[model samples]
Target: GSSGSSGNSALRIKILCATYVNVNIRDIDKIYVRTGIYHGGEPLCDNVNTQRVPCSNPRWNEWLNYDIYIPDLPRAARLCLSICSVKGRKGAKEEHCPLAWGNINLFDYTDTLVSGKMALNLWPVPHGLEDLLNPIGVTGSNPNKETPCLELEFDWFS
Candidate 1:
């Protein structure tokens, strides 16, 4: 679906939209997803943008393809999603902020990267997610909190 080469190996992915009935916000203007591999000294990040709309269970469908390269062996590989708000009528960039954040574990899915379709539910940061942070924080239920949740999906290809 895309193209890029930089390391010993590379990954091609099809970024899909997220869906949820409860999102702590009235609407989400945009979602910025950055994918990367962290092995040590330097990390590689490929950004994907999901069009504007609300955060609720909206039938928002979009396609964002990315090709990312992996590094040696550091802590983890992930996807950082920043939910932003739109201030204007939708075309012009008005105002935005970090509504929520998400991290995915690409390191553990080495085999899946070759072929997999996943639904990732992300949580808000700087909270009681201490135990939920690692590859574990990458999934689960909406633990008692004010922040609703951010839903995201991905399709991987060899």
Candidate 2:
């Protein structure tokens, strides 16, 4: 017999859009977003990417779903979002460049799910780093108002 469990739950994330994505790249063809759930620096699921859209300030309004059991959800789990810029023409070689990255915890310190609409301050992608998988424990918002900021909606159901 099961005691306390949230069975067969699912987490739905809505990537509304990004605003004020100020960058110096002049040849940017398009932009998109990549997202994933990481626990203790390890990936919990396959990464999802939004459709490519023109301009720095892009609107996706896309939804990503993940099947999970709430009772077994890791407290250290974090949702990572990355903004990427695409360059070059379709006939030529395309290059995917990482513009910025941001992350938020799925659960709070009190073990409550962090849900609802929130804006994540995007951090600039560091250079010379082979891995960009995790950015846990790092805190602070972008000081520049012109920097990239992501809008998202978090919802869960059982």
Candidate 3:
């Protein structure tokens, strides 16, 4: 029998932790990671946030899952990660600031699904309206020992 539709594939992402986050900790209370899949500068699904931890070298080791058919994946789909810090609380409100953002293309130039462990260099959040989207600036190498970096694990299957 010919297969009409294979059905949806599973995409599993594991947010391990962040390290070498070069940021002032004077007024910051805690730090956490926010992750989502984006295309056309907008998220395609609900964003996930890791549990809050102390600002010093936070770790989550949490997993976020998504379901999509491999054949239906968008060419512009990307994994967006943000390293955010929690500022001091005011009354009952706590302000959250994204210190840096990073992006990883779901598929490489060869159009193959990217898998395995990876380290993403987080870039400083840009100013103005485009701040919500990941920056297109070049990223790699740590000029300073304190350059922020996020660790993640990726896997997908039909």
Candidates in order, TM-scores: namely: 0.53, 0.80, 0.77
Best by lDDT: 2
**Displacement of the residue 86 alpha carbon in candidate 1, Å:** 1.9
**Which of the two, 2 or 3, has more lDDT?**
2
For model 1, give the 10-residue run with minimal summed lDDT: 128-137
Q: CA lDDT of each candidate?
A: 0.45, 0.73, 0.69
lDDT (10s digit) by residue, model 1, range 57-117: 3334555555564443233445445444445554666654444455555555443332356
Cα displacement (angstroms), candidate 1, residue 142, comes to: 6.1
lDDT of 2 by residue, 1-158 (tens): 87854443777888888877845666787888877777877777677778888875588888867655566678877777778776787689877777777877777766778777888678777783344334453544567676789998977765
CA lDDT, candidate 1, residue 88: 51
Which pairs, if any, clash in model 3? none
lDDT of 1 at 81: 51
Report model 3's TM-score to 2 decimal places: 0.77
